[PDB]
Design a protein around this ligand. Sequence first.
Ligand SMILES: *[C@@H]1O[C@H](CO)[C@@H](O[C@@H]2O[C@H](CO)[C@@H](O)[C@H](O)[C@H]2NC(C)=O)[C@H](O)[C@H]1NC(C)=O
Ligand SMILES: *[C@@H]1O[C@H](CO)[C@@H](O[C@@H]2O[C@H](CO)[C@@H](O)[C@H](O)[C@H]2NC(C)=O)[C@H](O)[C@H]1NC(C)=O
Ligand SMILES: *[C@@H]1O[C@H](CO)[C@@H](O[C@@H]2O[C@H](CO)[C@@H](O)[C@H](O)[C@H]2NC(C)=O)[C@H](O)[C@H]1NC(C)=O
Ligand SMILES: *[C@@H]1O[C@H](CO)[C@@H](O[C@@H]2O[C@H](CO)[C@@H](O)[C@H](O)[C@H]2NC(C)=O)[C@H](O)[C@H]1NC(C)=O
Ligand SMILES: *[C@@H]1O[C@H](CO)[C@@H](O[C@@H]2O[C@H](CO)[C@@H](O)[C@H](O)[C@H]2NC(C)=O)[C@H](O)[C@H]1NC(C)=O
Ligand SMILES: *[C@H]1O[C@H](CO)[C@@H](O[C@@H]2O[C@H](CO)[C@@H](O)[C@H](O)[C@H]2NC(C)=O)[C@H](O)[C@H]1NC(C)=O
Ligand code: 01T
Ligand code: 01T
Ligand code: NAG
Ligand code: NAG
Ligand code: NAG
Ligand code: NAG
Ligand code: NAG
Ligand code: NAG
Lengths: 733, 727
Amino acid sequence: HHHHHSRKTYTLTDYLKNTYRLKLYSLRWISDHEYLYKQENNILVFNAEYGNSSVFLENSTFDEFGHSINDYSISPDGQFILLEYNYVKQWRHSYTASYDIYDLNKRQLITEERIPNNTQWVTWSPVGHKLAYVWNNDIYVKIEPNLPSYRITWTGKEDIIYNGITDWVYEEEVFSAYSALWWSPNGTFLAYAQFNDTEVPLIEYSFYSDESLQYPKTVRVPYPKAGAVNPTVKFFVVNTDSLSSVTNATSIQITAPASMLIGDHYLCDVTWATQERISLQWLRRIQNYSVMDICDYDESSGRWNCLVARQHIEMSTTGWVGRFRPSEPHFTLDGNSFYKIISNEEGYRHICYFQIDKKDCTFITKGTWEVIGIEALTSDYLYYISNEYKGMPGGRNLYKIQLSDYTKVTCLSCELNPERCQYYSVSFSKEAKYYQLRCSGPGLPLYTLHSSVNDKGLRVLEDNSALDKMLQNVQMPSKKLDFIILNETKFWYQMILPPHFDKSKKYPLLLDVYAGPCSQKADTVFRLNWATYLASTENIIVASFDGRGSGYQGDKIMHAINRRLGTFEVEDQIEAARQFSKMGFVDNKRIAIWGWSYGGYVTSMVLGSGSGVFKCGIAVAPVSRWEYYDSVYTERYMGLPTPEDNLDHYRNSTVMSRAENFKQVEYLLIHGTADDNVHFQQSAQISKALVDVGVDFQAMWYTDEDHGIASSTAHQHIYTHMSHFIKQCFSLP
Amino acid sequence: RKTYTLTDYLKNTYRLKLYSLRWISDHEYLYKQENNILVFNAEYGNSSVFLENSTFDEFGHSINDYSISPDGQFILLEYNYVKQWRHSYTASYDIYDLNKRQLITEERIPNNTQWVTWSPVGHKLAYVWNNDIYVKIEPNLPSYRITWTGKEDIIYNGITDWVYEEEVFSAYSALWWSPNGTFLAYAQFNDTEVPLIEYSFYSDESLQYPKTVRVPYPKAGAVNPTVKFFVVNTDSLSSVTNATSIQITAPASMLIGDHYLCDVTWATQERISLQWLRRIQNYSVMDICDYDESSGRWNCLVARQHIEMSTTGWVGRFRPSEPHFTLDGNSFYKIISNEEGYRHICYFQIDKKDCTFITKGTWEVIGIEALTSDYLYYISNEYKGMPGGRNLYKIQLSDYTKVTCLSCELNPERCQYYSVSFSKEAKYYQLRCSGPGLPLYTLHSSVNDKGLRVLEDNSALDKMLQNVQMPSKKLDFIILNETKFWYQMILPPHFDKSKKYPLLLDVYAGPCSQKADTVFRLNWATYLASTENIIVASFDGRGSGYQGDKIMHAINRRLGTFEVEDQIEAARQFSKMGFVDNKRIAIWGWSYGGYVTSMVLGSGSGVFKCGIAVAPVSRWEYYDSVYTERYMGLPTPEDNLDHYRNSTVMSRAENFKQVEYLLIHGTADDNVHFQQSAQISKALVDVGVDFQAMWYTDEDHGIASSTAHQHIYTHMSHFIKQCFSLP
Ligand SMILES: *[C@@H]1O[C@H](CO)[C@@H](O[C@@H]2O[C@H](CO)[C@@H](O)[C@H](O)[C@H]2NC(C)=O)[C@H](O)[C@H]1NC(C)=O
Ligand SMILES: *[C@@H]1O[C@H](CO)[C@@H](O[C@@H]2O[C@H](CO)[C@@H](O)[C@H](O)[C@H]2NC(C)=O)[C@H](O)[C@H]1NC(C)=O
Ligand SMILES: *[C@@H]1O[C@H](CO)[C@@H](O[C@@H]2O[C@H](CO)[C@@H](O)[C@H](O)[C@H]2NC(C)=O)[C@H](O)[C@H]1NC(C)=O
Ligand SMILES: *[C@@H]1O[C@H](CO)[C@@H](O[C@@H]2O[C@H](CO)[C@@H](O)[C@H](O)[C@H]2NC(C)=O)[C@H](O)[C@H]1NC(C)=O
Ligand SMILES: *[C@@H]1O[C@H](CO)[C@@H](O[C@@H]2O[C@H](CO)[C@@H](O)[C@H](O)[C@H]2NC(C)=O)[C@H](O)[C@H]1NC(C)=O
Ligand SMILES: *[C@H]1O[C@H](CO)[C@@H](O[C@@H]2O[C@H](CO)[C@@H](O)[C@H](O)[C@H]2NC(C)=O)[C@H](O)[C@H]1NC(C)=O
Ligand SMILES: CCc1nc(CC(C)(C)C)c(CN)c(-c2ccc(C)cc2)c1CC(=O)O
Ligand SMILES: CCc1nc(CC(C)(C)C)c(CN)c(-c2ccc(C)cc2)c1CC(=O)O
Ligand SMILES: *[C@@H]1O[C@H](CO)[C@@H](O)[C@H](O)[C@H]1NC(C)=O
Ligand SMILES: *[C@@H]1O[C@H](CO)[C@@H](O)[C@H](O)[C@H]1NC(C)=O
Ligand SMILES: *[C@@H]1O[C@H](CO)[C@@H](O)[C@H](O)[C@H]1NC(C)=O
Ligand SMILES: *[C@@H]1O[C@H](CO)[C@@H](O)[C@H](O)[C@H]1NC(C)=O
Ligand SMILES: *[C@@H]1O[C@H](CO)[C@@H](O)[C@H](O)[C@H]1NC(C)=O
Ligand SMILES: *[C@@H]1O[C@H](CO)[C@@H](O)[C@H](O)[C@H]1NC(C)=O
């Protein structure tokens, strides 16, 4: 006699075994009317206007092949397909893989002049079927897929000289990519960066590997910690049409500006404007000054030239320039103008309209909200995402703005499904005739397709009704997205509330913390994660809070922690906890705090604060002191760890120095041994300090796991482990 | 009515008083009463301050240790102590003239000297620095260089490499002065092709980039260090020509393949004995080498070779025993297994194969302690048939049948575990009784064997222990397949045998181990018994020591089988004794005992609720060649690969589902590498077993740092108390 009431909950197994799948819709636009999708593991080409799914590639072709086909890549012209296999992961983006190319018209593998094994990166020209691949740190170009490669660079040395690929920091921090190659639009020019790691110190750690391995391997990665000598970067442009089979290729060098070359600098952005015009952005090591150079190819020269009068300066007096780097330029077709997200005179990031010749721009948008990204630019409209709608920073909508009248601004996604959908993202066709919208919350992810000619709805691609059906008689948690006012300012929190939430009861509470520079933890997105389980099954409330230092709410909030990590953002996590219990449904005797990565640091700094507010906390892969983390992230917020700069605060913001206070709290410290990103060192130094002052804590290392602890088994283990620690810290039976 | 607490254990509230003396002559010894150093007299007990505390006040450094030259003329001061491995360290050195009474300033001993040793007589000095051997005839003269081939991590002259240090010589030094200091004998190790274990050292907070420690370390079946042996004549050193080292090459029976130098013992002024072991450690050879006049060389008569082998196991307990030579050096005594597999003393004559045995029985000689012209002194576990007791015996060389227990009845109730230190010519001896009562130190004259006085009786300790509720120690045996197997229990105070107690099986169980003994201890177990009322038991099953080869050799080539089964069996038996709550049986252990605990918990026997494993071996291929191959052979298909493979704790991961496990390991363990545990944890992860872990940053195999030590025991206590429902 259950009477069809919901007695199921979202269990830990549900989360770990992926019981309730969240269906996606992952397309790849090939033309301006067609995209690709995998159905039966077949790849169908879809006509966006009609529905025409006419099988593009049967799943049964590449099993004759004899290797597991990891990913693929159709050449712009549709004439060739690149097959990726023996994929072997490295850092967040980099990896090695074998490639073959299948002649999509001759229905056969190209067996001549194959792309070598251990290839680091491969990339089509944007038009036709030119290749650009990097093998042993050198660039190679194939004009036709079955002809021999032309060697572009000869100077690549492992760990020292990188041609067309990033090194550790550029990959993680600057480009969010292994690739450092940029084809010109019609693919005449291949522009590449080149990195020099000669004097960059190495992080060494042990990789134990399969129990087969008798002697643990020592991994050595060129990794510049805050203050250490950084990599250097030269930048080149080669003309791939004048490549010669009888002469080494001439790579033309663009040097940095004079204002950059005086000290340690970076290349933080490459952007082709036209067939013959390219834009560079460079950053000083002190990341409050950057210069965009605009460079033209001089025809009689053969060389490239950036005129000083086309140099564009971006700087900040209140902090660092950009959200994590200067913003990318979006050029108008003729190359003479570009749009860019820059911070306005009120510290709000808006789209500025730049002329190649005039220093000053004009803002096409304004207000106490923020522009997230520019997504497409036609001749009449510019398409961008912002958190303007209902003045709530954790929302996302697509707007189009009229290039000829800035007051004329339509919200393309706002009114679509207002109750279900408040966090959108967009994929445009080759020339923006169609777009797929991707709604992520607060309701179930919704995937829709649109023609932009008249902004009408075409079809629902995925609506997740299968998951919706499964959830009916499941006691899911609800989200509350709201704000509290501190010192005249709105700060936004979110609570994952247990089913049948009762304001009368005093629930235990976990503070899910990240709280890094330009972070946003309080948003409109639907999630099925650990938090979901904790609320639904364990009746724990999971809360997050964006305090000083968080993103998308202006520079006043975001820069608040500039040169001052481990301060306000930490303080504001504590204040949220106070504010929450003071809301009346939180059991004070049971407030916990957990974070990964930067979140691990704040968690640890919080537990270390002697605030009395928190009972326990889990820190996963945390930063312990800032001299341990990488230069370009750290120095952005922290300056240099020198007496004549910011050493005082580097010293004053270590969790180690707070060790004594951990006596008041139950700590679980977790870290994977092969964490190349935030090194096990950071947690080894934490443990040592707690040992040194006689405080009991709980620890867990993960053999061979990196910063993700992403192994299937590892992922399931760590979450099991934390649930126990939490249930046991909360006296949950 | 207070109990022995964890704080009591960790902070050392109740100290055992030692009487650490060192002999100077046949009748004088040195003691450290105060900061002072006194020469006591054995004849009377009267003394006189030999070295006033504040004389090296002026020095401006902290004095770690001292060392008098035999002739009593010089004192070596050791400071700037920097520990390395178990025995190995680096120090600085100054010499203080006692005839003058001032520090030597000319030709000082270098900083970072690896070893120093006086000649056995006079004041000659031989030291090792940057891997080369130096000698100083006079403490203020230029030292002569002997070796020019020393190289960091590669060539060791006069000092041992990691493995020889840890496993063969239990010492950093590899130097041997002849009885009267005429000859310097030394070993040379070549680690050229020995792989390096590499691990991170995080060091102080201030260190931005972890340092990789790289140590040549041969794991099971890896290329071993090679060894050469040399003898140089110190009396005929030249300030002009490079000193000229004579080599004594291994016997042909050794050169045939991989081998070890395992014993260096000077027989006479011009005779030195060497023991070499094959890599397959069941066959060893002793060369006896005489100095030769007409050639200035050393010849080891092939006829004079003495073979010691073993058909049921390996030679020796942990290595073939050392010889003890009669003054003329034409005869020696050493401990070997008899035909019954019990280790007894064999009298060898230099010029023949057949030694005759001088002791007999189903007990074992632990050691030959001193030999005179009239008597042989040994320690053995014979008294009352107790493998875990120790007593000093004298045997009359002119009639083996006449054997007096010198310590058995000196105090039968409180004393059953003695050790002895004899004076230079053995006219006196000091007895150290270690249990079962509080330790008692006594001084004895040989001639009539009468006791002279109590040196330390721990009456101070005795007082304090009276108003604290102390545990007791049951030592006893069970029968298994018609054989005695000894166990001990640390029973809580006011022990009631009709009440059911939690029981923690404390395990080591490595080969030749002995965990059940008459020794008195203040340790972790003492706290668990006194405060938490936990029975903590240990058990010597198969493979255990001091009960003959039949038992010891039982686990030959089969590590992680019988020694593991027997702990489970012991635990099963204990839970039929009626006072053991078998819902709460736990097992823990360190090192090899970490391995066994882990192997036990992976057994799916269902006997154990939870375990702690501190620095466990996880599979044998990860641990060093000398130790591992002794019991396992090579990890190759033509030898013992199959069993290496079967004996892993990783293979048993699935069974950990049945148990609560705590894995602990120091990240800078040079011995049992963190790897071993990193591999265990990974296996548990892979099969979805939840467990508890703890690393110790920069701790080694001891986890010995004041603070680290305190932390780990606290952590374990919490784990055990939780596993047992003790709040
Ligand atoms: C990468 O940079 C290093 C410097 O970090 C370059 O090596 C230098 O070569 C020049 C010419 O001999 C000198 O200024 C220095 O003596 C060298 N410095 C060091 C420390 O090596 C190297 O040439 C660069 N590599 C390339 C090919 O770009
Ligand atoms: C009692 O002990 C003291 C201190 O050991 C004795 O003094 C030493 O006696 C020896 C006799 O061989 C001399 O070599 C030394 O000169 C004495 N000590 C020093 C360093 O000066 C003393 O003789 C002993 N006996 C009596 C009867 O007092
Ligand atoms: C051994 O080490 C100490 C420490 O370095 C040496 O003493 C130093 O000598 C230098 C001269 O090179 C002086 O400038 C320092 O003031 C001394 N330091 C201290 C703390 O005493 C000593 O001379 C070294 N050499 C030997 C052979 O003893
Ligand atoms: C230590 O042993 C090594 C063998 O591992 C010796 O090194 C070899 O020496 C020979 C002849 O000198 C060379 O031809 C080999 O190529 C060497 N091998 C390597 C890798 O070093 C070395 O000579 C020995 N050193 C001493 C002082 O005994
Ligand atoms: C002692 O032996 C060493 C090494 O065999 C000699 O010293 C070397 O001599 C060579 C010439 O063969 C020189 O090139 C080296 O620079 C020397 N090395 C060192 C460390 O000194 C030397 O012949 C001998 N020295 C004496 C005292 O006789
Ligand atoms: C998807 O369907 C369209 C329309 O139904 C296909 O276009 C037709 O192709 C046939 C020949 O096969 C022509 O005779 C018709 O005139 C076309 N009709 C229209 C209205 O386009 C189209 O070929 C299909 N898509 C793909 C990729 O083949
Ligand atoms: C999107 C995930 C991510 N991306 C980035 C790279 C960009 C800044 C370009 C976005 C970084 C910067 N290294 C981090 C990060 C890592 C460590 C720490 C101490 C702080 C921040 C994370 C978070 C994470 O997974 O750890
Ligand atoms: C006396 C202590 C000791 N001594 C030795 C050296 C001799 C056997 C020569 C005496 C060894 C041999 N390495 C060990 C040992 C260590 C690890 C393992 C897997 C096995 C054995 C221990 C035990 C310990 O320190 O934990
Ligand atoms: C890649 O490696 C495999 C295995 O050695 C080999 O058979 C294959 O031919 C290689 N491919 C290329 C293109 O080098
Ligand atoms: C191209 O350059 C490399 C070194 O810079 C050289 O080895 C090679 O021979 C060159 N080839 C030509 C065409 O000169
Ligand atoms: C002028 O002279 C150069 C050098 O001979 C020749 O290559 C070209 O014709 C002219 N160069 C340019 C850039 O106009
Ligand atoms: C950049 O930072 C430096 C050091 O913090 C400081 O001197 C200066 O104010 C900043 N420069 C600019 C251009 O704002
Ligand atoms: C030491 O031994 C050598 C060789 O036996 C001998 O020639 C010398 O005289 C001895 N010195 C003493 C004091 O016995
Ligand atoms: C020594 O051990 C090996 C391996 O167990 C064996 O094959 C050999 O016969 C043994 N030799 C002796 C002397 O017993």
